[PDB]
Design a protein around this nucleic acid. Structure first.
Lengths: 183, 62, 386, 17, 108
RNA sequence: GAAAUUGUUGAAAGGGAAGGGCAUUUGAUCAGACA
RNA sequence: CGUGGAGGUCAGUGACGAAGCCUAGACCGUAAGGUCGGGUCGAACGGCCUCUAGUGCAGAUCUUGGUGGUAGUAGCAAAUAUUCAAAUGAGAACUUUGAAGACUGAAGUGGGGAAAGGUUCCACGUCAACAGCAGUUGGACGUGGGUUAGUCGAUCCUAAGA
RNA sequence: GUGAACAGCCUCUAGUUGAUAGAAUAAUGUAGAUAAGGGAAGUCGGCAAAAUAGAUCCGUAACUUCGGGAUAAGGAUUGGC
């Protein structure tokens, strides 16, 4: 029930998470980073279009030896893919998060993905057979997923410090001089 | 609907191979309830299971 | 140790790197030298390659065994509709190269030339030179003051010409644009000639003559990633070679301990910029002339197009330039023709050619007839005839 | 569990002499 | 957006030219789905079982150079169907499937 | 509930390595005589 | 200087929080190290004088366990081949039914057995793990049913032998 | 069925349609082919591939332990009605 680092007002958020999910952690991290900070409506149309193959997930860190594509142009990247299985899971948790927001009474329009993170889960292990009768491993890589959605707000900052100036004796003598010369 | 056991029983009761037994595709819910060789023997009479004919091997050219 | 038996290297190091060209147009690096004495005239032209055909002619080469005898040679036709002049640019000589100083465009530009400034024409507002055209106004002070600077400062004057693509049968609607240098006359006469010819056409017969020798620039036919044996002609390894035999065996010595640029390696073959030279013109035909393919000795009303049209091009309906042999490029591509850069006094250069017969049998197979009237005479009535 | 054995042995040719 | 039926002819020679033999009949299925989309604008195309027999009459690599077809654009009665409309292709029985041009078929 | 290894957040640097020693400029952070 | 344990003392510390852990927060020492603040946690620990030893790690192709870069990379390419519709279902390239096209081609991809396995046989429910993709299916998981002899074998006889 | 033939090829009864798939068709590969003129000039070496091939009739050398060599070598024919 404890989440990662967050900085938003809890009264104006709704969270969802899922654990021990059998989906690639490298692919799922790229999916999550691509939704990070978007408005909830925009992110859900975006993911549907990845499945339909019209847009792509920019691959940043886990991208060694993968193919190029003309759909990374918009994101500034030359390598991108369409992680179908990992889009379904992130898609499921966003739907859960929307449901929780309406239970708390939040206004469905202002929600945005203020937090999302993926980290590793305990391995699931198997065996592969190699030449000369040698066994190796054929493990998997499940993943934990969590996210939060928050109401956007308008800045209301005010009441700042005056920053009083501490003058020396020599300075105050100068300032008094300037006053006498002119108003 | 999983009528795999109905082909097996039908083949023995009608006395032909599984390649020669026909199950009506519009009577799935009926065949599904035939778990006895008596039931398969009653559907063959009804016409829900019919015996496919043997492929021809004509000796005319020979 | 030393290589046992000597041999010349494979390939030419002057044509490196062997990479795709930057643009589908091969650019005219050098234009002919100028002399101010002659009249104003273009130094190059733009056209579209069509195909090839065959020519039979006598040989005027005293001394050779085939003097005053028939010989069969190959020729390639270039579809050359007239070009339209749409601007002038002036170049000043600076210690670190030439440098443009101003470009003065005409007022009304055709749609096919302003397609060259749009990628997504079908959803554009067609805002191109819209504000520039309001410069002619009631007086044209702005335009005439710009031309004043070209006369005052420029040392080389050029002209912008766009080809009239719509006439050729290509499915393309966007028109090419390229710069051609003006040779002849003072710097004052050069810029005046351009101004009079804005929106006007310049035909091929006003640039080239029949027996001239010209140079062709164009981008070669592409083939993609290619192995060593067909990129550099290296020897093939014997049959019993593990891990392939279309490969270069030794790619260097132990030291320098780095693969040398001189070694043959696999990569792009084709799609380079080339400049062939010394091609003799054989005919400068006229588009609106029937019997484009006739000759003094043939005398049959037939055009240059074979039966069934040039394969992969279509039919020729404009002027054309047929030259001796091959020019770099594939069919349908833009090809730019240049005047030679030196005075060639050889016998071949000065020889005058009068043709005797141009071929028009179909190139889509083993053609047997030259005209549809010839087919009917030989075969006679068929079932599909009335 | 994984039993293990001498990987290859032989098939290494000979050297200098 | 309308219920319309029409009759076409598809040149399958120029679409299966060079295709591997074990994949000629299967690929023809795909091209009749691409063809019906190009003319009816429906992503959902259902090929009648009788058409499947016309294609596979002469094995994998015995497709006919031309086939006369009937494409019917209809409404989707299924709940929550992604697309309102869908197409349905059937075979047309004719002596020779060449020399014919497209024509609309009236409902009644 | 440590370390290796890992995700998000925040600060900073980055022309064919990174790390360290003497000295200072800049950013952040700490203590105070106090009467 | 530091560690496990032992005899004396500080009538030492502590559930109002002992030991352990984390902290580009602070102080003492040339150093080995000692000391304090904050956070986490939950039950026992230290100063000084002495005694004792299974008493300090960067290596040993060190022992056991855990984890990376390589890397979403190499790869899942033998045995001719799949396709259309409905049914079921949250979900169908892979299950069920029907139509089509193919293969084994009677020293078969058919029909039974001997050694060996031991319930894999059949039914109902069912998909977390297994079927190096999928799965609603399965030789998988849960629960049960099933193998009928005077005549077929063993048993009885003897062979090389024990 | 073809044929000398439980050779190779096609089929009937019966049985499977099982081996991760979709999309393009670069270089280098594995497997299968074909090449004008020359015909071993390649290579340590005809390595690899090619050419010959069934059946009927004719003809068949040296040497020989008289049994063989021998399918020697070299030719001709072949369908349908």
């Amino acid at each position: 029930a404890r989440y990662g680092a967050t900085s938003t007002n809890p009264a104006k958020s709704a969270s969802a998470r899922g654990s021990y999910l059998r989906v690639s952690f490298k692919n799922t991290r790229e999916t999550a980073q691509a939704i990070n900070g978007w408005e909830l409506t925009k992110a859900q149309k975006y993911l549907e279009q990845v499945l339909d193959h019209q847009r792509a997930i920019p691959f940043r860190r886990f991208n060694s030896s993968i193919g190029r594509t003309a759909q990374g142009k918009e994101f500034g990247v030359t390598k991108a893919r369409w992680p179908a299985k990992s889009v379904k899971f992130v898609q499921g948790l966003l739907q859960n998060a929307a449901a929780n927001a309406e239970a708390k009474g939040l206004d469905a329009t202002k929600l945005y993905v203020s937090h999302i993170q993926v980290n590793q889960a305990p391995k699931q292990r198997r065996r592969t057979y190699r030449a000369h009768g040698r066994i190796n491993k054929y493990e998997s890589s499940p993943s934990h997923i969590e996210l939060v959605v928050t109401e956007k707000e308008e800045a209301v900052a005010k009441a700042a410090e005056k920053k009083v100036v501490r003058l020396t004796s020599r300075q105050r003598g100068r300032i008094a001089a300037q006053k006498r010369i002119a108003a | 609907a999983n009528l795999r056991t109905q082909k097996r029983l039908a083949a023995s009761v009608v006395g032909v191979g599984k390649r020669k037994v026909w199950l009506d595709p519009n009577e799935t819910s009926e065949i599904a309830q035939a778990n006895s060789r008596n039931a398969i023997r009653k559907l063959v009479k009804n016409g829900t299971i019919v015996k496919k004919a043997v492929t021809v091997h004509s000796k005319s050219r020979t | 140790s030393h290589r046992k038996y000597e041999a010349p290297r494979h390939g030419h190091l002057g044509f490196l790197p062997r990479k795709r060209a930057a643009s589908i147009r091969a650019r005219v690096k050098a234009f002919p030298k100028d002399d101010r004495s002659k009249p104003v005239a273009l130094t190059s032209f733009l056209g579209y390659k069509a195909g090839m055909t065959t020519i039979v002619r006598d040989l005027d080469r005293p001394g050779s065994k085939f003097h005053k005898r028939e010989v069969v040679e190959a020729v390639t036709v270039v579809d050359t509709p007239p070009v339209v002049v749409v601007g002038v640019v002036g170049y000043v000589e600076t210690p670190r190269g030439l440098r443009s100083l101003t470009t003065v465009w005409a007022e009304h530009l055709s749609d096919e030339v302003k397609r060259r400034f749009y990628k997504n024409w079908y959803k554009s507002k067609k805002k191109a030179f819209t504000k520039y055209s309001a410069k002619y106004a009631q007086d044209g002070a702005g335009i005439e003051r710009e031309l004043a600077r070209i006369k005052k400062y420029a040392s080389v004057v050029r002209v912008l010409v766009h080809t009239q693509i719509r006439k050729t049968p290509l499915a393309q609607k966007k028109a090419h644009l390229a710069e051609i240098q003006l040779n002849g006359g003072s710097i004052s006469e050069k810029v005046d000639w351009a101004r009079e010819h804005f929106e006007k056409t310049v035909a091929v017969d006003s640039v080239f003559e029949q027996n001239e020798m010209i140079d062709a620039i164009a981008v070669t036919k592409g083939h993609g990633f290619e192995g060593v044996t067909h990129r550099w002609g290296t020897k093939k390894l014997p049959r019993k070679t593990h891990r392939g035999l279309r490969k270069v065996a030794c790619i260097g010595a132990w030291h320098p301990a780095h693969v040398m640029w001189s070694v043959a390696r696999a990569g792009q073959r084709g799609y380079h910029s080339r400049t062939s030279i010394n091609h003799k013109i054989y005919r400068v035909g006229k588009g609106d002339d029937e019997a484009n393919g006739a000759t003094s000795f043939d005398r049959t009303k037939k055009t240059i197009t074979p039966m069934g049209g040039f394969v992969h091009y279509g039919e020729i309906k404009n002027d054309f330039i047929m030259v001796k042999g091959c020019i770099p490029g594939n069919r349908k591509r833009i090809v730019t023709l240049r005047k030679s850069l030196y005075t060639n006094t050889s016998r071949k250069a000065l020889e005058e050619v009068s043709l005797k017969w141009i071929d028009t049998a179909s190139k889509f197979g083993k053609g047997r007839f030259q005209t549809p009237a010839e087919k009917h005479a030989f075969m006679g009535t068929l079932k599909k005839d009335l | 569990h994984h039993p293990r054995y001498v990987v290859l042995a032989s098939h290494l040719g000979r050297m200098m002499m | 957006k309308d219920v319309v039926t029409r009759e076409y002819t598809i040149n399958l020679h120029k679409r299966l030219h060079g295709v591997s033999f074990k994949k000629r009949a299967p690929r023809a299925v795909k091209e009749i789905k691409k063809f019906a989309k190009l003319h009816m604008g429906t992503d959902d195309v259902r090929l009648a079982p009788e058409l499947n027999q016309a294609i596979w009459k002469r094995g994998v690599k015995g497709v006919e150079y031309r086939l006369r077809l009937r494409i019917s654009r209809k409404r989707n009665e299924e709940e929550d169907a992604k697309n309102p409309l869908f197409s349905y292709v059937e075979p047309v029985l004719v002596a020779s499937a060449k020399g014919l041009q497209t024509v609309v078929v009236e409902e009644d």
